[PDB]
Paper text:
WES identified a novel heterozygous missense variant in SNCA (NM_000345.4, cDNA 174G>C; protein K58N). As previously reported, WT a-Syn fibrils adopted two similarly populated conformations, consisting of one (1PF) or two protofilaments (2PF) respectively. In contrast, K58N adopted almost exclusively 2PF conformations. An atomic model based on the 3D reconstruction of these fibrils at 3.7 Å global resolution revealed a similar protofilament fold as in WT fibrils. However, K58N fibrils present a higher twist (−1.29 degrees vs −0.81 degrees in WT fibrils), and a slightly shifted protofilament interface, possibly due to the proximity of the mutation site (K58) to the interface stabilizing residue (E57). Additionally, no density for residues 14–25 was visible at the periphery of mutant fibrils. The findings from cryo-EM data revealed that the K58N mutation preferentially results in 2PF fibrils with a similar protofilament fold than WT fibrils, suggesting that the mutation stabilizes the WT inter-protofilament interface. In WT, K58 may form a salt bridge in cis with E57, which could destabilize the inter-protofilament interface and thereby favour 1PF structures. In contrast, the K58N mutation may prevent this interaction due to the altered charge properties, thereby promoting trans interactions with K45 of an adjacent protofilament and thus favoring in 2PF fibrils. Altogether, these results indicate that the main effect of these mutations in fibril architecture is the modulation of the WT conformational landscape, favoring either 1PF (G14R) or 2PF (K58N) forms.
Mutations and multiplications in the SNCA gene, encoding alpha-synuclein (aSyn), are associated with familial forms of Parkinson’s disease (PD). aSyn, an intrinsically disordered protein, has been a significant focus of neuroscience research not only due to its central role in PD and related synucleinopathies, but also because of its abundance and function in the nervous system. aSyn is primarily concentrated in the presynaptic terminals of neurons, but is also present in other cellular compartments including the nucleus, and is thought to interact with membranes adopting helical conformations and tetrameric structures. In pathological conditions, aSyn is thought to misfold and accumulate, forming pathological aggregates that disrupt cellular homeostasis, in a process that may ultimately cause neuronal cell death. A central pathological hallmark in PD and other synucleinopathies is the accumulation of aSyn into insoluble aggregates.
Residue numbers in the entry:
A (entry chain C), B (entry chain A): 36 to 97
Write the structure that this text describes.
């Protein structure tokens, strides 16, 4: 299928995932997987297959 | 006289005079004279003398 997408922007500043942490014991920032953060962010047919994306963190501290 | 001034800033972005103009016939931006636009902007005894600062524009179009 056609996905024509016309974005004419005068001016644009786009910020993706932001990680800010102050006065933290132990810090683990988890950013990854499938993230698209452009001015014209277009994503299609992501993992149309069997597999899938997974962004997971392994902090336990038992 | 004493003018102790203690400014401890975590983070600061300061913008001076801003000139934005779109679709203008004839443009004359006049920024000058005595302008101080720092993070810690301190001005004292400006033209304590006879003279004075003057920021003037000479547009007539008669």
């Amino acid at each position: 299928g056609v996905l024509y997408v016309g974005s004419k922007t005068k001016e644009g500043v786009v910020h993706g995932v932001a990680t800010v942490a102050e006065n933290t014991k132990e810090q683990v920032t988890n950013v990854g997987g499938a993230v698209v953060t452009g001015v014209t962010a277009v994503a299609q047919k992501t993992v149309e297959g069997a597999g899938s994306i997974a962004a997971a963190t392994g902090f336990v501290k038992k």
